Amino acid sequence: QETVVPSRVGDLKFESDFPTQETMKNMLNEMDFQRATQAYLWGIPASSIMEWLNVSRNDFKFEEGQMGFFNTLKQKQGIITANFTTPYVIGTWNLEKTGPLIINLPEAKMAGMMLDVHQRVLSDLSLLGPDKGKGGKYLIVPPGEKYKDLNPKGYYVIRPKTNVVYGGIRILEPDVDRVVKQVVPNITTQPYADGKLGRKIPVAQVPEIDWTHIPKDGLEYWKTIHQIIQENPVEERDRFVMAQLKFLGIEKGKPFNPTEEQKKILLEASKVGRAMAQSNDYTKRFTQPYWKGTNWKDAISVSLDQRSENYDELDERAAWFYEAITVSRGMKSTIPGFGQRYLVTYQDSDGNWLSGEHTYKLHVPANVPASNFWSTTVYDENNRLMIINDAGSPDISSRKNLKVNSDGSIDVYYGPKPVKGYENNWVQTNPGEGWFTYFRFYGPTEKMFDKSWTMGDIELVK
Amino acid sequence: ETVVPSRVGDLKFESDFPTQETMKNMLNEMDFQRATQAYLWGIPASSIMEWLNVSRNDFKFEEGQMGFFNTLKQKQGIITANFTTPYVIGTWNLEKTGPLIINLPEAKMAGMMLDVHQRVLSDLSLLGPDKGKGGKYLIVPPGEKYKDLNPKGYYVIRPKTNVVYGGIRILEPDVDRVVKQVVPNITTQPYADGKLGRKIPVAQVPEIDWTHIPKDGLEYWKTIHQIIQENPVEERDRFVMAQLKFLGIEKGKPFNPTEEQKKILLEASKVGRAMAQSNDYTKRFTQPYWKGTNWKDAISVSLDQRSENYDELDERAAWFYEAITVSRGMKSTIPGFGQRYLVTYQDSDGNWLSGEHTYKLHVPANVPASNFWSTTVYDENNRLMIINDAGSPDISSRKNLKVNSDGSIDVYYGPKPVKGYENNWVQTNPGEGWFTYFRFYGPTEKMFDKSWTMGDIELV
Ligand SMILES: [Mg+2]
Ligand SMILES: [Mg+2]
Ligand SMILES: [Mg+2]
Ligand SMILES: [Mg+2]
Numbered sequence: 001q002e003t004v005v006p007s008r009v010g011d012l013k014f015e016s017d018f019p020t021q022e023t024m025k026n027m028l029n030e031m032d033f034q035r036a037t038q039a040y041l042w043g044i045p046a047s048s049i050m051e052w053l054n055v056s057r058n059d060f061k062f063e064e065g066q067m068g069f070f071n072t073l074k075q076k077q078g079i080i081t082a083n084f085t086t087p088y089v090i091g092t093w094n095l096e097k098t099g100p101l102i103i104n105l106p107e108a109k110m111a112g113m114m115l116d117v118h119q120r121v122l123s124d125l126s127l128l129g130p131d132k133g134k135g136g137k138y139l140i141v142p143p144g145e146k147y148k149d150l151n152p153k154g155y156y157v158i159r160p161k162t163n164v165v166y167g168g169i170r171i172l173e174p175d176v177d178r179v180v181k182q183v184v185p186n187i188t189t190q191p192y193a194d195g196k197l198g199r200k201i202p203v204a205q206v207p208e209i210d211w212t213h214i215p216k217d218g219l220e221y222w223k224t225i226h227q228i229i230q231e232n233p234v235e236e237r238d239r240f241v242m243a244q245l246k247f248l249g250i251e252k253g254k255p256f257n258p259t260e261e262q263k264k265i266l267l268e269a270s271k272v273g274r275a276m277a278q279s280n281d282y283t284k285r286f287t288q289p290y291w292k293g294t295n296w297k298d299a300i301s302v303s304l305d306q307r308s309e310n311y312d313e314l315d316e317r318a319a320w321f322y323e324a325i326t327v328s329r330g331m332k333s334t335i336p337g338f339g340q341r342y343l344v345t346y347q348d349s350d351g352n353w354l355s356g357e358h359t360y361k362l363h364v365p366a367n368v369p370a371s372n373f374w375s376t377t378v379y380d381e382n383n384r385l386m387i388i389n390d391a392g393s394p395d396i397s398s399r400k401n402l403k404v405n406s407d408g409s410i411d412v413y414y415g416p417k418p419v420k421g422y423e424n425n426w427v428q429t430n431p432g433e434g435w436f437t438y439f440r441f442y443g444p445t446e447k448m449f450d451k452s453w454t455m456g457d458i459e460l461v462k
Numbered sequence: 463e464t465v466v467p468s469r470v471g472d473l474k475f476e477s478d479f480p481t482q483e484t485m486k487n488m489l490n491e492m493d494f495q496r497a498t499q500a501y502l503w504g505i506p507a508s509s510i511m512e513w514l515n516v517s518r519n520d521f522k523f524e525e526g527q528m529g530f531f532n533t534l535k536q537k538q539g540i541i542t543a544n545f546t547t548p549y550v551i552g553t554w555n556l557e558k559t560g561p562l563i564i565n566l567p568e569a570k571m572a573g574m575m576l577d578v579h580q581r582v583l584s585d586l587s588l589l590g591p592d593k594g595k596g597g598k599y600l601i602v603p604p605g606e607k608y609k610d611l612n613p614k615g616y617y618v619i620r621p622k623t624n625v626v627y628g629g630i631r632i633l634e635p636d637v638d639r640v641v642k643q644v645v646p647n648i649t650t651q652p653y654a655d656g657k658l659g660r661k662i663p664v665a666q667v668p669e670i671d672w673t674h675i676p677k678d679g680l681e682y683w684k685t686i687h688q689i690i691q692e693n694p695v696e697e698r699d700r701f702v703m704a705q706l707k708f709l710g711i712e713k714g715k716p717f718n719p720t721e722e723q724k725k726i727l728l729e730a731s732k733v734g735r736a737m738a739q740s741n742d743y744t745k746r747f748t749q750p751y752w753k754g755t756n757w758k759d760a761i762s763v764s765l766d767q768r769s770e771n772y773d774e775l776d777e778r779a780a781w782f783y784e785a786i787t788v789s790r791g792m793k794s795t796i797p798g799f800g801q802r803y804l805v806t807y808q809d810s811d812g813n814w815l816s817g818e819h820t821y822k823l824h825v826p827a828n829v830p831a832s833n834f835w836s837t838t839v840y841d842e843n844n845r846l847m848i849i850n851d852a853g854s855p856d857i858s859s860r861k862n863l864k865v866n867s868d869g870s871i872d873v874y875y876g877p878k879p880v881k882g883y884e885n886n887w888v889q890t891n892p893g894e895g896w897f898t899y900f901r902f903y904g905p906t907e908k909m910f911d912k913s914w915t916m917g918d919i920e921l922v
Contacts (some may be wrong), residue, residue, distance in 0.1 A: 001893040005732065005736075007729060007732050007733050007736075008494060008729045008733065009733055012732070012733075012736050015814055015816075015893065015895075016814050016815075016816035016817070016842070016893065017841075017843050017894060017895040018739070018743065018807065018842050018894035018895045019736055019739050019740055019743070019840040022745055023736065023740070024739070024740035024743065027733075027736050027737045028737070028740050028741070028744060028746070030737065031499075031502075031737045031740075031741070032471065033500060034495040034498055034499055034618070037495060038492075038495055038496060038499065041492075042701065055701075146538070150528040150588035171494050172504065180578040234771045234772070236698050237695045237697050237698065237700050237701060238701075239768075239771075239772050239773040240503070240698060240699075240701070240702070240772070240773055240775050241701070242771055242772035243769075243772035243773055243775040243776060244499070244772075244775065246776075247746065251771065252770075252771040253771070255787060267467045268468065271466065271468055271473070272469065272470055272473075272488075272491070273470050275468075275473050275480055275484065275488050276488045276489075276491070276492050278479070278480045278485070278488075279480055279484070279485040279488035279489055279492070280488075280489070280492070282479070282480070282485065283485055283489060285708065307700075308704075308712070309714075310695045310700075310703050310712065310713045311695070311701070311703035311707060312699050312700040312701055312703075312704055313704065314701050314704040314705065315704060315707075346479070353476055353477055355476075355477040356477075361815070380478075381477070381478045381479050382478045405578070431477055432477065432478065433477030433478050433479050452707040
């Protein structure tokens with residue numbers, strides 16, 4: 001006898017209890033689809049790091065294991081939600097190709113970290129790191145069992161659980177030009193084999209070309225997921241995800257040459273997945289508003305090792321790493337005057353999404369709870385990069401700008417430019433909505449304690 | 463506003479930002495997809511947890527007590543069970559019993575030690591460490607408290623979860639005699655820091671209707687939640703836990719779903735089951751055992767569910783959706799030892815086996831089995847031994863069959879018996895789909911090398 005069962009995915013048809021042939025084909029297509037779609041979210045963090053490594057080796061063409069200097073707007077433009085204040089020193093490499101690598105870090109006041117491909121923190125660097133700003137030598141060891149017994153004396157031995165690692169550093173001193181010329185030249189990476197040191201690799205300077213490490217879309221996304229899997233070992237927590245991608249044509253040790261049917265499912269997974277990433281990130285259902293009555297929320301909810309008590313933070317890391325890159329102890333600092341804190345808002349005081357054609361205003365109260373500096377940077381929602389405007393000015397930082405008499409500071413966001421507020425203006429873009437992070441570099445007590453707070457952005461012109 | 467159509471509905475955006483409605487729909491579809499995939503993930507553990515719930519609340523045996531299953535009524539509730547070898551099975555939660563010893567006598571048995579997800583911890587008896595000579599197995603809880611417990615004289619088993627399973631089968635043809643000798647000498651016994659508790663004898667299964675098969679709708683989710691509570695969280699399952707969180711399922715918290723969560727879970731159970739059937743019956747991860755036939759070796763999963771670069775999520779869900787337990791021995795390549803299982807759900811025409819029709823299976827002479835062979839009919843819906851008016855769900859070589867001149871045997875399946883073949887007949891129910899397992903107890907080299915082969919089930 002036949003029987004039909006309606007469902008969210010369509011009518012399920014059975015013949016003599018067994019599913020019909022067509023229903024099985026459909027279900028296996030639905031299963032592969034759902035699996036690919038959820039894998040999309042699972043892959044957000046690694047996609048970012050992998051795509052950065054591709055740019056480094058293929059576009060910038062830096063030596064495998066070589067660091068890069070990012071400072072100018074054109075250099076930083078490709079970095080997801082980067083700031084346009086602190087000089088960056090960044091590098092990504094595959095430990096399997098480089099072998100044990102050393103990171104000779106100079107004595108200076110920097111903020112940084114060591115990350116694995118999925119962006120878990122292996123160690124902070126400089127001030128809030130083992131060296132405490134005094135400098136030191138960090139040996140990064142490949143997860144290969146070969147190097148299991150590698151523990152050389154005189155180094156901060158770091159052992160990532162994957163091959164594709166990442167290192168990032170920031171110059172915190174306001175005398176940018178002076179410090180870079182004093183610290184960067186001394187920052188270097190260096191091979192280490194058996195018991196002999198190799199040639200030191202200097203920090204190269206990033207070229208002036210169009211680029212970005214943001215996760216790609218369509219099938220490009222899967223090709224890179226496939227790449228992530230090929231360059232790294234398979235970790236226990238990811239064994240089921242691997243099982244779920246198998247029939248989509250993605251497997252470790254096998255080329256990615258998907259069939260048409262696999263492509264069709266994958267294209268859909270990328271589309272629906274992207275929408276879900278947006279949804280999970282802007283909703284941020286696992287956290288709450290930093291300040292009641294506002295849409296401001298601490299942007300970083302993920303743990304350093306991505307471990308909660310009974311689960312690994314798939315959603316928390318999916319949200320934060322969808323719009324940003326890296327995390328560290330400092331980035332979640334509760335130490336007065338050290339590290340940084342990040343608050344984000346995607347809407348105005350009416351809960352409406354911020355769009356580049358309207359005029360907005362953010363009232364920054366006096367005595368901002370920050371020791372080094374504070375800033376507001378605008379990013380485009382679509383790419384989550386510093387919005388490219390006519391002015392060539394992505395943000396506003398504690399610098400040369402109009403300051404109210406009560407010591408408050410008003411920031412304006414709009415297409416054109418408010419009169420008298422030319423120093424405190426942010427040029428948006430017609431119907432190209434955006435958002436922004438309010439950076440706290442060297443956050444004090446009143447920011448942690450919620451003694452000092454701000455309101456959401458208010459709409460001005462229609 | 464922009465709109466992008468998709469396989470899950472039209473996606474709407476306001477200035478690039480997803481609309482409020484779209485975000486809600488995405489989170490909803492996200493939870494649905496996750497719960498649907500978790501359903502498949504939990505197939506194995508569900509079968510065992512449900513059995514332990516029956517042992518505790520329906521049979522009401524002690525936590526840690528074994529059960530004797532032998533009559534059709536006793537085994538009826540066991541997923542794809544045989545009606546040939548007496549069973550001695552039990553399931554318990556180590557955290558509740560504490561270290562538990564399995565006092566195994568000397569005998570020709572086939573059994574295993576499984577964890578909640580049905581990974582093999584060890585084989586028992588003949589193909590096990592005691593080699594049929596008998597012995598004592600000490601199953602230790604995963605807690606860090608007993609992390610050093612390693613007393614001499616026992617076979618120390620270290621499960622990774624709390625809910626474990628123990629199964630044994632009497633292989634001897636003299637069932638009435640061997641049962642009386644062996645089962646009375648089988649017991650489980652608590653071990654607490656050196657001292658032994660009282661021995662727990664095997665209890666006969668009460669005459670009542672039961673089944674450990676996974677439940678449907680929200681009943682399945684309540685049990686998945688229970689599995690979570692009763693066992694620690696393992697690394698490989700950390701993301702499944704993350705995905706279940708917003709559906710109202712977390713360890714350490716009660717299961718009290720919101721109206722919205724229940725709607726998602728019900729659909730997930732419905733779509734998850736259909737996917738379970740599809741994954742199982744299609745078996746795209748394997749192929750026919752004998753070329754040109756629908757027969758396939760029913761077991762593809764590895765003892766520890768570990769393949770080279772992934773854990774066998776699909777192979778696990780396929781075989782455990784239609785069966786229970788695994789061991790080195792149901793995958794034996796050792797001649798005359800262990801068992802092997804072949805399955806078919808379709809006739810030679812590729813059509814689903816349905817009870818309203820009459821079929822015939824031609825079993826060649828010299829079946830490659832040193833102990834016995836059989837064909838058991840199971841219903842597709844519950845995957846339990848077929849319930850017919852005849853009270854006979856199978857045909858085994860132990861029975862009184864009408865052998866052929868050349869020694870071959872003709873088995874018939876139908877709602878009505880075939881002229882002079884009642885002894886080689888298994889009654890089926892019209893309109894009800896069925897499938898069958900062909901068991902090889904004591905498989906010979908002719909089975910492994912494919913030298914001996916059998917055709918598909920013919921219609922009419
Ligand atoms: Mg930054
Ligand atoms: Mg930092
Ligand atoms: Mg059996
Ligand atoms: Mg066995």
